[PDB]
Amino acid sequence: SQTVHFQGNPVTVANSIPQAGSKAQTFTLVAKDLSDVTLGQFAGKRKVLNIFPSIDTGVCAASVRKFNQLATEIDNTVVLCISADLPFAQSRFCGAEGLNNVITLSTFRNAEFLQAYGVAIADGPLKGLAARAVVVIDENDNVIFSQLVDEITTEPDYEAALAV
Amino acid sequence: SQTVHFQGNPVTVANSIPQAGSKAQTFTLVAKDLSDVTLGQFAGKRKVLNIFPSIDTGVCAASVRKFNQLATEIDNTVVLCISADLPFAQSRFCGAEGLNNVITLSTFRNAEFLQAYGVAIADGPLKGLAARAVVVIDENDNVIFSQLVDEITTEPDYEAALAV
C-alpha cells in the first residue's frame, strides 16, 4: 500500500501511515526491562515516535542524535525510538545519550503495531523490520504530523522533530 | 504446553519439544546476511539446534563456547545457534565466532518455528523469546536428542553437545 526504497531496490510497506488530525491508535511495545508499555501510559504528553529499521547499526550519526535532541526540547515531550531490535540490542543505541525523555521500545512481540501504524516492511531482505518513519502525537493523542522516509537509510527532516 | 523456570519462577512453553525418535519438522530461519535458510539445506549432516532466549545479553559464558566446540567434535556436524535476536545482534555472539560450522539463525520473521519446535515462551516478560533448549537431528533428519532446560538462565547438559 506504500512503497519506499533500499539499496537501489523498491520496498513494500503495508497499509498507510497515520495522517494529521487523526486519533492515534493505541499500541503495546516492550521496554528495556521487558515490561509492556502502551500509549496511554504517556497520556497528557506529546509523543514523538521515532521509527527505525534498526537502531543497532554500530554507527552514531550526528544527524540521528540531533533529531532526538530537537524532539525532546519541545515542552512536555517523550521520544519513543521504536524498532524490531530486541530490548537487549537497543541499549547500544547512541543517538540519544543523556536525553532522559527518550525511551527505546521493541516490536519483537507486537507486530500488530507495525501494521496499524503502516511501517511494516512486507518484502525484500528487510521483511519483518520497521520502515524509517516519524509520527508526532499531541497531548490529546491526536496525530499532528507523520512522515514515511522514502529512502530507508536516510533520516527524516528535522522539522518533524519540532511539530508543535 | 510444558513448564520450565526463569530465575526460579514457573514459565509456560508452547506445545512440546521434539522428542527423541520423532521426525524433525522442516523450518525456515534467517541467516546473518538476511537470507532465508531451511533445514533441508543441511541435508546429510548432524544438526545441533542450540536454542537461546537471547545470544546478545552482553555476558559471554565460557560454557557456551565449550559446548559448541564439543558439538563440532562429532562427525559431520553443523551447530545452529537459534534465537529471536535480529541477524544484526547475533553477530556479537561469542559462543560462535572462532569455530567453524557454528552458525547463528534468527526467528525474527519466522516465529512459527518456536511454536513448531515447542520452545516458544508463552508468558511472563520473556514472552515471545525462545526457551533455552537443545535438539539434535541426525543425517536421516530424525531427532535423536532434545532437552528443554529446566532453568532458562542455566546452560544445557554437555551430553547434549555429544548426542550421537
From Swiss-Prot, chains A, B:
Question: Outcome of altering residue 81 to S?
Answer: Reduces catalytic activity by 28%
Q: What class of enzyme is it?
A: oxidoreductase
Q: Which GO terms describe its cellular component?
A: cytosol; periplasmic space
Q: Which organism is it from?
A: Escherichia coli (strain K12)
PANTHER family (alphabetical) = THIOL PEROXIDASE
> GO molecular-function annotation terms?
hydroperoxide reductase activity; thioredoxin peroxidase activity
User: Which reaction equation describes what this protein catalyses?
Assistant: a hydroperoxide + [thioredoxin]-dithiol = an alcohol + [thioredoxin]-disulfide + H2O
What is this protein's name? Thiol peroxidase
Main site of residence?
periplasm
Cystine connections: 60-94
Protein family (similarity comment): Belongs to the peroxiredoxin family. Tpx subfamily.
Location of the protein in the cell: Periplasm; Cytoplasm
The GO biological-process annotations, alphabetized, read as:
cellular response to oxidative stress
